[PDB]
Structure formats: structure tokens, C-alpha cells
């Protein structure tokens, strides 16, 4: 029982954008002139990426002998779920978890005349309860044919490393699945719509939108962490308050990069602008407009009930079966504060930026201005250049070249405008640059 | 778009690179950044630009 | 363009100078900065402006 | 032009003053800064404005 492969091409799933060998051969003064002196360039390039299927190859000197394998490397990786810090404790076998909450009561007018018969009357405390139940029950199964795997290895260290890699893989699968379940919890909550929505603009489209989103988040956190409490930030409204050290904010890498590039760097003493609560970075959200979610540490009610591993052996087949059983309960608390921070649609063109924000030019010199348009769609729009405050003889061409008249004492305002509206109703996006006139 | 075209494009390139590096260095890993489509993970001290 | 015409051109000149200095300082050498093309290498401590 | 006319004129005057002081302080001296047309040099601690 031998499995052999015949006449397999080296480039199976390779779709070459261009032939690098052909470019080097027919290179005439281009960027490929550097590889011309190389003598083994074709041989290097033909197997540089790597060959998926190995073929036995005789060496050059004695055709009888076959070239051997000189090195074997095993790659091992470890994966964890950053949301694991939101996990609660462990319940061994107690099915169902009960959550209780006692609400406040109303005030009554004092009247001793009516306080003679109503002494024994009752008043229910107005308590609210909910329940959580086990909802995750899975297992990971993998087989190892150790006896049959001994032919593919020469040393015992490689065999042990391969077995350890299999175990590491079966653990990493559980880790990534747990991470996906935790993200699915938030997605399910937003789908059910129990989140408290806050309408914002897209923070990744403009700098002003990002700053206003930051302001809105800071205000929301401030009113969340209020001593009196409020009922406007949770489903089944009840008077509760959070804490600044307990609040958690979940964003994505794009938002983090835009915040700490466009805002945090350009802002002095950024302690008054950075996010108030703890910041966690995840791999986006499955919802259409869900940008960032601001919840409390008590919002997550994830518990585990079983984490077991079993091994069985098949003497007839000479292999081992490993089973990893994970039983968990995934739930959230409706008495905890939650803010959804959702955004609507965006226009075709958001903003226009002139590369020199401030400039100083002489009375005879010229300046060049470059306009960058932040357009979401794949289409492109042309810019129109203008000068608002200037004398006669100072003008800007259509390509962004500004020429200053021989004599003027005024401040120049160069504007680039993009028209995205329809006819008879123009909507304009304007980017401005401030230019000073030094004397000549 | 272009790194040297304008400052507004240079900052966009910087933002894109930073976001790409951050999503490359994620604890859960991803398989969207390699030709084997295998769930792998990288490190900041091991990334080279 | 001109060092004195505008403040932007001065910054552009500074950028060009810094890029040229780095290209000269590159370890692998380059034959594009001398009167007769020979693969040569310079040092930042030895460069004078 | 005028020190007090505008900020641009003021900074141009500052640049001219600094350049003149430097070229007066240059070690090799010059004949273009005295009424006797004689080669001499000044010092930064001896120059007064």
C-alpha cells in the first residue's frame, strides 16, 4: 500500500500577475536592470516560493544515489481569546443561575389621622428577577495513528513535537471558538435590540466626526458614572449606576489607529481627549452599523461547567482518540448599562484636505497646493480651486498653482471645492489653506 | 493611494499600516494574511517593515 | 524650487537633502552620486554639508 | 521694508539681521562692512545692536 504522485507541476495554484523571468530578460533600463548580472536568477525564482509536492531527485555526480532531506522544522502556534478577562467564576453542576434586583419605592405623605388603620397594610418591594441556563455543549475529537506515523520521521524528537503540535491545535480550536461565542453574544444582544442606541456619524470618514464621537462617548460615560444613577442606559429600566474602573469600551483596529494618529498625536496633553474607560480591541463587528460598544464588567455572565479531556485506544487499529469536552453557559445581564453607539449612512465625499495647511509666500513667488479627497466609493471627483481674499493679479490656476501679485498686503485663503450634488442644487465640500504674504 | 503625493495621503498610509499591524498582532489570530490560509499569529517584535 | 520663495519649498529642500543623505549612507552602496560610476559607500560622520 | 509694518516684514528683518551678524562674525573677514574698506573681522560678544 504505497501512494505515489506522478508528473505534478510546480506551480499548481499560482496565478502570475507578470512573468518576472520574462521582465528580467526583456529589461531595458527599467527597475529590473539590477537582476541582470545575476546568473542563477531563473533557478532561484522557479522554486523560491516553494514546492508543495516533493519528488525524488538524483544528484549530479552519481545518478544511482538519491538526494536526501537535510532539515525538518515543526511550526507551533498558541492562540488566546482577549475577551477571556470577561469570564466569571465556575459553577460545578448547578443548573440555572438566578439574578435578583430590588428596586426603589415611592414617597408617601405623612398623616397620623390615616396612620391608625393602615399600620398593618403591605407594600411589595417590587423585586425583579431573571434566569440564565447552560447553552454551550461541544467537543473536539482527533485521532493519532502513532504506529503508522513512525515511517515519516527519523528521530523521536520530531515525532514528539508533531504530537505536541496536534495537542496545541486542538486547544487553539477551542480558544478561537470561545472567542467567537463571546462576540456572538454581543451580536445577539444588538440583533434583539436591547442595547441603548446612540446615533453618531462615521468616525472613520472625517476628523470632525471622530472628535464629535469622542465627545459623545465621554459625555455618555460621565452620565453613566453618576452617583444618583439613571434608567436610560439599560433594558427593563431600573435605577443603577456604574463605575469608571468597571466600564469597558470595545473598538476595532481601524478606529484605534485613526484615533491615535489623527487626534491623540496632534493634541497636546491628550489626557483630556483619550477614551475614559478601558479599551479593548477586537476583530470588527458583524452588524451593519455597530461601531463601538460601551458596557459594564458585570454585563457579561459567562460561566463554565465542564472542561474535560478523555483518551481511548483502538488495539485493532493501533491509534488513539482524544476528546475535549467543553460545557459552558453564555448569558448577559439586563441590569447592566450598555450603549450601542451606532451610525447611519455616509455621503459619497466626506472631506477635502489641502496638504500645506499654512504657508508663507513672497510678493513674486508661486506656491503649489495638493488636494486629497476622502471618498468612500470607488469613483473620483475633480476639485475646483479658488482664492477668497486677494488683490488684483493674484490668482490660482486649475492645477493648484497660486501666483501672487507684485504688490498686496492681505491674507490669502486658498480653497478647494468638490461638488457632489445634482444640478440646480449644489452641495459643496471645501478644504481651506491659509497663506501669508511676506514683503519683497 | 500614494505615500509621497500629499500629507493627507501620507497620514492615510500611516493609519492603514498601523491598523494592519495591529490586526496582524491579534491574540486570536487570523488566516487572512497568508497564502496557506492557516490560522496563525505574529508578534510586534517579529514584524519587519 | 527656491529656498527663499516660500516656506514650503524650504521644507521640500530639507526633505530632498535628508533623502539624498540617507541614499548616500545606504550600506550596499550606489554608483549614482559620483562623477565616474563606481559602486561606493559613504558614512554619515564623514558627510559634510 | 519696515520692522513694524507686518509680521512678515518683522520676520524678514530678523532673518536679515541674523544673516548680517553671521557674515560679520565669519573668521576670514570682509572689506564690505567699514568705511575704510579694510579687511577685518568682528566677534559675537563684541557686536552690539
mmCIF file of C-alpha atoms in Angstrom, chain A residues 87-91 97 132 300-305 327-331:
data_model
loop_
_atom_site.group_PDB
_atom_site.id
_atom_site.type_symbol
_atom_site.label_atom_id
_atom_site.label_comp_id
_atom_site.label_asym_id
_atom_site.label_seq_id
_atom_site.Cartn_x
_atom_site.Cartn_y
_atom_site.Cartn_z
ATOM 1 C CA UNK A 87 -15.256 35.402 32.207
ATOM 2 C CA UNK A 88 -16.872 34.933 35.610
ATOM 3 C CA UNK A 89 -16.285 32.099 38.080
ATOM 4 C CA UNK A 90 -17.262 28.433 37.820
ATOM 5 C CA UNK A 91 -20.398 26.565 38.883
ATOM 6 C CA UNK A 97 -28.443 30.769 37.674
ATOM 7 C CA UNK A 132 -29.666 32.019 32.840
ATOM 8 C CA UNK A 300 -21.106 39.502 30.790
ATOM 9 C CA UNK A 301 -22.409 36.435 32.653
ATOM 10 C CA UNK A 302 -20.268 33.722 31.055
ATOM 11 C CA UNK A 303 -19.633 30.675 33.240
ATOM 12 C CA UNK A 304 -18.097 27.272 32.577
ATOM 13 C CA UNK A 305 -19.485 23.943 33.786
ATOM 14 C CA UNK A 327 -19.684 22.735 28.577
ATOM 15 C CA UNK A 328 -20.369 26.428 29.191
ATOM 16 C CA UNK A 329 -23.238 28.825 29.847
ATOM 17 C CA UNK A 330 -23.256 32.103 27.901
ATOM 18 C CA UNK A 331 -25.585 34.878 29.045
#
